[PDB]
């Protein structure tokens, strides 16, 4: 019963096309984008230099949005 948020699997610079090799899941705080968006962030770049271990936010992804 833990919310798994997207976590920069590795260094992710600004305007970096997110990839399944650059994203992952991990219980972090505060929580950000849901792991259920993993396949959503894919192909989508970031609107900021997000370093590894840095939780992914819905306000840190370009062309992102809910459903």
mmCIF file of C-alpha atoms in Angstrom:
data_model
loop_
_atom_site.group_PDB
_atom_site.id
_atom_site.type_symbol
_atom_site.label_atom_id
_atom_site.label_comp_id
_atom_site.label_asym_id
_atom_site.label_seq_id
_atom_site.Cartn_x
_atom_site.Cartn_y
_atom_site.Cartn_z
ATOM 1 C CA UNK A 1 0.000 0.000 0.000
ATOM 2 C CA UNK A 2 2.835 2.340 -0.898
ATOM 3 C CA UNK A 3 2.579 4.892 -3.681
ATOM 4 C CA UNK A 4 5.431 4.307 -6.099
ATOM 5 C CA UNK A 5 6.485 7.514 -7.811
ATOM 6 C CA UNK A 6 8.794 7.878 -10.787
ATOM 7 C CA UNK A 7 12.421 8.285 -9.784
ATOM 8 C CA UNK A 8 15.188 9.393 -12.116
ATOM 9 C CA UNK A 9 16.966 6.100 -12.684
ATOM 10 C CA UNK A 10 19.903 8.198 -13.822
ATOM 11 C CA UNK A 11 21.049 11.733 -14.545
ATOM 12 C CA UNK A 12 18.414 13.483 -16.623
ATOM 13 C CA UNK A 13 19.254 16.899 -18.085
ATOM 14 C CA UNK A 14 16.733 19.459 -19.275
ATOM 15 C CA UNK A 15 15.000 18.570 -22.521
ATOM 16 C CA UNK A 16 16.049 14.962 -22.073
ATOM 17 C CA UNK A 17 13.764 12.480 -23.792
ATOM 18 C CA UNK A 18 12.724 10.307 -20.874
ATOM 19 C CA UNK A 19 13.260 6.592 -21.360
ATOM 20 C CA UNK A 20 12.524 3.316 -19.611
ATOM 21 C CA UNK A 21 16.263 3.252 -19.033
ATOM 22 C CA UNK A 22 16.145 6.679 -17.432
ATOM 23 C CA UNK A 23 13.118 6.135 -15.226
ATOM 24 C CA UNK A 24 12.077 3.840 -12.402
ATOM 25 C CA UNK A 25 9.947 3.499 -9.293
ATOM 26 C CA UNK A 26 10.696 4.029 -5.621
ATOM 27 C CA UNK A 27 8.920 5.194 -2.487
ATOM 28 C CA UNK A 28 10.210 8.735 -2.136
ATOM 29 C CA UNK A 29 8.986 11.846 -0.362
ATOM 30 C CA UNK A 30 7.474 13.906 -1.399
ATOM 31 C CA UNK A 31 5.887 11.666 -4.003
ATOM 32 C CA UNK A 32 5.661 12.751 -7.623
ATOM 33 C CA UNK A 33 4.507 11.339 -10.940
ATOM 34 C CA UNK A 34 2.947 7.891 -10.499
ATOM 35 C CA UNK A 35 4.847 4.832 -11.662
ATOM 36 C CA UNK A 36 1.737 4.188 -13.721
ATOM 37 C CA UNK A 37 2.964 7.045 -15.880
ATOM 38 C CA UNK A 38 6.278 5.332 -16.518
ATOM 39 C CA UNK A 39 5.054 4.329 -19.983
ATOM 40 C CA UNK A 40 3.681 7.846 -20.251
ATOM 41 C CA UNK A 41 6.860 9.758 -19.498
ATOM 42 C CA UNK A 42 8.581 7.605 -22.091
ATOM 43 C CA UNK A 43 9.308 9.671 -25.179
ATOM 44 C CA UNK A 44 8.620 12.748 -23.086
ATOM 45 C CA UNK A 45 11.465 15.070 -22.165
ATOM 46 C CA UNK A 46 11.911 16.985 -18.931
ATOM 47 C CA UNK A 47 11.436 20.706 -18.425
ATOM 48 C CA UNK A 48 14.349 20.833 -16.012
ATOM 49 C CA UNK A 49 17.643 19.167 -15.175
ATOM 50 C CA UNK A 50 16.487 16.245 -13.066
ATOM 51 C CA UNK A 51 19.461 14.424 -11.528
ATOM 52 C CA UNK A 52 19.372 10.751 -10.617
ATOM 53 C CA UNK A 53 17.514 9.932 -7.423
ATOM 54 C CA UNK A 54 15.448 13.059 -7.948
ATOM 55 C CA UNK A 55 11.762 12.224 -7.762
ATOM 56 C CA UNK A 56 9.903 12.910 -10.987
ATOM 57 C CA UNK A 57 7.128 15.482 -10.866
ATOM 58 C CA UNK A 58 4.183 16.203 -13.174
ATOM 59 C CA UNK A 59 5.423 19.775 -13.340
ATOM 60 C CA UNK A 60 8.873 18.661 -14.429
ATOM 61 C CA UNK A 61 7.819 16.896 -17.606
ATOM 62 C CA UNK A 62 7.136 18.594 -20.919
ATOM 63 C CA UNK A 63 4.014 17.495 -22.756
ATOM 64 C CA UNK A 64 2.847 15.678 -19.647
ATOM 65 C CA UNK A 65 -0.618 15.501 -18.137
ATOM 66 C CA UNK A 66 -3.090 13.185 -16.392
ATOM 67 C CA UNK A 67 -5.805 11.096 -18.002
#
